[PDB]
Amino acid sequence: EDPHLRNRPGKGHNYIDGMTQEDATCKPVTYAGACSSFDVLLEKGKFPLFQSYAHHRTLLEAVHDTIIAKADPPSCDLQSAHGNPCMKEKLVMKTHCPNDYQSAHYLNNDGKMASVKCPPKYELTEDCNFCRQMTGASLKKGSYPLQDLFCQSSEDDGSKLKTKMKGVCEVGVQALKKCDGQLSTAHEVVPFAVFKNSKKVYLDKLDLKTEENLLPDSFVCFEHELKSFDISQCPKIGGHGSKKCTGDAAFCSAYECTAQYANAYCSHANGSGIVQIQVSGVWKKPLCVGYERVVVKREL
């Protein structure tokens, strides 16, 4: 929604635990204010999949809506001489980090959110693999999203789904099969999804479909310089609510529209809806869908 990209589905919380100095503008993200964990996602060019589904949830939003669980540990001490459990996963990802970030976050192989973190006064290097003393006067307050992805709630069981890629010996940290022969190696942009009770599923092809609907997250509302408005205060047709609302024809097909007396205006959010993905011939409803650039090894 051209003007409502900051009118977030769900709670709209774009912070990472332990970095709460940006909560005024990140918890929630809304029309006013800058949020270092979220604004980078709307820079055109970057995150083209998320911008195609920008009314779906971010990774941090999904975590705070309890759609995606936090990894344990939730953050990896990058500088630590003893190593850390993210290191292997991070090193197979080719990523670019702007300066002044102390933290960056990603969906790990378990389908949980992990993060790499520097000590205070240190920033992530441009490949996000090391920490160095900060180059600026101050660090950003949030965490850089390392993957181009979007999320949604889902109860579709994915326990049986696994990565299937033709002629791939290894993708990311996943060994699909041992290859006796000479292999080629490349950094490739690979689509992936995570499902309920599944690990990360890499795919040869991204095939998605959206069913539009009239559920609450399919709308954005604002006071009638925008101020957002919580649609749960709007009465359904024939129902009760704490405020009076109006909106477009889609909204008024489901909610009672009061026109003159309205406190708010509600618009259907462009591109919102139930997303499904085709995985090895079968359509499933994922929790998150994304791209990431990882090392892929293929039989020659």
Epitope: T20, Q21, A24, G33, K121, S138
Partner: antibody, heavy 125, light 116 residues
């Protein structure tokens, strides 16, 4: 805009439980993402945070006091309350309820701080 | 839990500038936090003056004169309140405050006397 008003006994006996209530008018303690707090100040001394609620759903306490302190909420009456157990002469203080801003990027929530006038509590037999 | 140390008293003359310090303990870093400053005059609750995170992320309290400003000293791990063009009405107690996750931490406060 928002106004806060403390209510309570003024006198409590040693080892008893101090109970106080804050009534909020002009805004709702149940939405907006605001923090609603208890803070005390012994006359002639500093400020000590006791605990707060975030909207009406989560509660966090000063760790040095947590074992003696409960905060509860009455969303229907727009009130929150404090219970401090095992009181000693060291608990004699002026007890404020307050909502203080958190800020980032020039945006502050709330845009200004709100304080009640405070209620004086003397611990004495 | 962390202790914010403020000097118990300070003093300066009209038109001078008062510099008040708030030193964080060595295990946390001043660069990480919004620093909030509060003023308390006799008979009133404390009042929010301003917050400071960085030169590009800072704000003044509504109705608080511009002559109050905040800054940080990374090497000394201190937050600083600078009161320029000191006026008689500025005699007060000043408290610094930080807001780590799930806590409010107040400094001990500095009693500022305006001389002369």
């Amino acid at each position: 805009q928002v106004q806060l008003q403390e209510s309570g006994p003024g006198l409590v006996k040693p080892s008893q439980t101090l109970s106080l209530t804050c009534t909020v008018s002009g805004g709702s303690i149940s939405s907006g993402g605001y923090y609603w707090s208890w803070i005390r100040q012994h006359p002639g001394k500093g400020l000590e945070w006791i605990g707060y609620i975030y909207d009406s759903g989560s509660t966090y306490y000063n760790p040095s006091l947590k074992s003696r302190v409960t905060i509860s909420v009455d969303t229907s009456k727009n009130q929150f309350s404090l219970k401090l157990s095992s009181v000693t002469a060291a608990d004699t203080a002026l007890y404020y309820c307050a909502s203080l801003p958190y800020c980032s990027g020039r945006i502050c929530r709330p845009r200004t701080d709100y304080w009640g006038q405070g209620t004086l509590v003397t611990v004495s037999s | 839990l962390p202790v914010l140390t403020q000097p118990p008293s300070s003093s300066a003359s009209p038109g001078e500038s008062a510099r008040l310090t708030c030193t964080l303990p060595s295990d946390i870093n001043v660069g990480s936090y919004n620093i909030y400053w509060y003023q308390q005059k006799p008979g009133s609750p404390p009042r929010y003056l301003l917050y400071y995170y960085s030169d590009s992320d800072k704000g003044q309290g509504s109705g608080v004169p511009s002559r109050f400003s905040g800054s940080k000293d990374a090497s000394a791990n201190t937050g600083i309140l600078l009161i320029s063009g000191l006026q008689s009405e500025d005699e007060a107690d000043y408290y610094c405050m930080i807001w780590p996750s799930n806590a409010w931490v107040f400094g001990g406060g500095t009693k500022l006397t305006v001389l002369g």
